């Protein structure tokens, strides 16, 4: 049960069955997917990115570590990904608003997580997805690779051929929710505390981008947008 590919191993672990590498995969997943969204929605210019490949056929733009500002955002995502190891990250989302600091959003790319116990089988515990995704089993490393490919392809398709262009003026933001399991002394570096998250217009539309299911974790990628 392992992926064999020089291209895949450049960005992802070839094995995701064990807890550590299942978590490590989630970290790289957060990085790759949210880099692609930042670029394909033209939130950041192409200079902040570098060309990467998920497959010898599929390419994506990842945040560069040469550029200081892009490096900073990468560490921000890395810090949120590191929270998955302890199971302290409930959801991380890229949130776009008309003005800086607004609670109500116009576009949201949410990644919600589920942590499994006892061999990565049993989910630890409302959201429409949870019931379905909690019942989803680990089906091997190759299935995970297929899920990752699907998500990246759906992101690029959604952002370039489905969603309308973002308005001329906006503020893009990364916002996350902590797990109840997370203790009061734990804080994810780069994220200032807040009693407010983000909200949605009642008429806003939603689309399911995809899901991820490595060994001991699960992720549900979703998109809310007025541009839809």
């Amino acid at each position: 049960d392992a992926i064999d590919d020089k291209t895949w191993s450049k960005l992802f672990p070839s094995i995701v069955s064990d807890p550590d590498r299942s978590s490590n995969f989630m970290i790289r997943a957060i990085y790759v997917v949210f880099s692609a969204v930042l670029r394909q929605r033209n939130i950041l210019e192409k200079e902040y990115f570098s060309k990467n490949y998920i497959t010898e056929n599929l390419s994506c733009m990842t945040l560069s570590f040469k550029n200081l500002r892009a490096h900073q955002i990468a560490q921000l995502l890395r810090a949120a990904g590191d929270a998955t190891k302890d199971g302290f990250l409930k959801e991380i989302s890229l949130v776009v608003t008309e003005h800086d600091g607004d609670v109500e959003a116009i576009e949201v790319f949410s990644m919600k997580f589920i942590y499994f116990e006892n061999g990565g089988v049993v989910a630890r515990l409302e959201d429409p997805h949870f019931a379905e995704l909690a019942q989803l089993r680990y089906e091997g490393a190759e299935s995970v690779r297929d899920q990752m490919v699907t998500i990246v392809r759906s992101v690029q398709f959604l952002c370039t051929k489905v969603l309308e262009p973002l308005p001329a003026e906006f503020t893009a933001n990364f916002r996350l929710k902590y797990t109840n399991d997370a203790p009061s002394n734990f804080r994810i570096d780069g994220f200032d505390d807040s009693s407010t998250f983000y909200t949605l217009p009642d008429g806003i539309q939603s689309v399911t981008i995809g899901h991820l299911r490595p060994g001991h974790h699960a992720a549900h990628m979703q998109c809310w947008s007025k541009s839809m």
């Binding site: 939130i43 950041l44 921000l76 800086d100 003026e169 906006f170 503020t171 893009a172 933001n173 990364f174 916002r175 996350l176 929710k177 902590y178 009061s184 002394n185 734990f186 804080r187 994810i188 780069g190 994220f191 200032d192 505390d193 807040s194 009693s195 407010t196 998250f197």
Partner: peptide, 14 residues
């Protein structure tokens, strides 16, 4: 420091 709020937000691109 100690944290009570369930949410965390970052910078921040306009």
């Amino acid at each position: 420091n100690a944290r009570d709020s369930p949410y965390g937000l970052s910078q921040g691109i306009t």
